[PDB]
Amino acid sequence: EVVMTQSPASLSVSPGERATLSCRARASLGISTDLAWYQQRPGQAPRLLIYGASTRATGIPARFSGSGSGTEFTLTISSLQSEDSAVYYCQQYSNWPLTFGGGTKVEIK
Amino acid sequence: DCTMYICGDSTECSNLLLQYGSFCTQLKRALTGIAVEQDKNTQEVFAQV
Amino acid sequence: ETKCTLKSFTVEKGIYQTSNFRVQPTESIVRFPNITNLCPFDEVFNAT
């Protein structure tokens, strides 16, 4: 099947500093920009961040930005606030082992 | 030799070749007859003394 | 074996071409290229 790795395990940056998340998938051929990013605050249900490689869905603040193609994908966030403290995921809708990311718990300094 | 010429030392080919009967017992006899005739031909000409 | 070839029980004097002899193999060897990674067939047959 297709299993992706989400590193670092837990980010730690101060507010006002850009935070970069990398989600890489172990695929011989790749995913071809068929990746999505998710946010799960404790309590309520998770909310989508970005569908596809770069484009954002309706209702997403300008603080989220996505990048990467082929096999390496990097997500960058600018101007962090207190509401950004949540577990971040990444799923690839390319093959049919439909699964989520390994789990990243970003921390605010 | 039919077995080597027709079949490349394969067991299955020989097993299928046995199904045809005696198509080489006749072929292997004409050549021996020709060889015996050739051996007699040279003797009928020179061996006269 | 000559009697078996002639399909009889009494063979007359002469020289006969009975059969053929061949040398049997000793062992079997196998040679393949050095490849270890698995083929990515799951992407082809499982496509979104």
UniProtKB/Swiss-Prot annotation, chain B:
Disulfide links within the chain: 2-24, 7-13
Superkingdom of the organism of origin: Viruses
Described purpose of this protein according to its UniProt entry: Precursor of the fusion protein processed in the biosynthesis of the S protein and the formation of virus particle. Mediates fusion of the virion and cellular membranes by functioning as a class I viral fusion protein. Contains two viral fusion peptides that are unmasked after cleavage. The S2/S2' cleavage occurs during virus entry at the cell membrane by host TMPRSS2 or during endocytosis by host CSTL.
Protein name: Spike protein S2
Included range, full protein: 737 to 785 of 1273
